[PDB]
């Protein structure tokens with residue numbers, strides 16, 4: 001077989017897919033990446049692939065340089081530039097994307113965070129035929145994976161990055177054989193995974209400990225969930241749920257121990273394990289107690 005491919009991508013999520021193309025018999029003619037370096041640029045250089053870094057793909061020059069490549073297909077993974085209509089019609093197999101959700105669920109920029117935040121028990125990868133809309137293209141293939149209550153967005157990101165590489169490669173093979181079954185997106189099931197707004201990262205202590213814990217997981221490593229302590233913002237990096245009833249109001253301190261800073265939520269208890277005060281390194285519950293223990297009064301203190 002062997003296809004001629006232009007690859008476009010920037011952050012670490014894209015690397016495994018690029019590496020899979022590099023390790024295959026397909027020919028990666030060029031790699032497009034953010035101007036300066038990205039993880040993608042590094043792997044391109046290590047493998048003798050020409051590196052193109054336009055600031056914009058609407059510019060006449062850059063647009064025609066791309067369409068003039070004579071690739072069979074363009075593969076796009078986490079690329080920051082919008083692809084112009086001509087770019088999309090440039091190659092016979094079009095532009096194919098590796099999207100980190102099970103479309104039509106979680107179209108948009110933050111599908112990993114949003115899936116975890118919602119308590120989805122599974123998510124996955126969709127290989128998508130790109131068009132001029134936002135993640136509305138036909139789905140060439142899907143592969144699902146479980147989300148565990150242990151997973152942060154970082155963990156899920158890494159898992160999906162590998163699944164995406166394998167699926168993309170398998171899909172390009174079926175795509176050149178003409179063995180792929182298109183799945184048009186069911187608009188009724190479509191949901192949008194927009195970027196996490198800062199206010200969304202604020203912990204609402206009235207919510208269930210279970211809901212807050214999902215927020216803490218979803219938002220690690222960005223933007224990190226946060227609450228307030230002694231008038232100052234406090235980022236919560238690691239937490240766990242304790243399914244025990246309290247008489248205390250939401251946000252009220254239950255107990256402070258090396259095992260965690262236990263806080264009453266609207267139901268159950270959230271236990272803080274790793275946290276961060278302004279301009280300070282992230283610290284354990286034990287460290288925090290050593291520094292600020294005199295301000296930790298069970299039944300009185302109050303977070304948020």
Ligand SMILES: [K+]
Pocket residue numbers: 021022023024025026027028
């Ligand atoms: K190759």
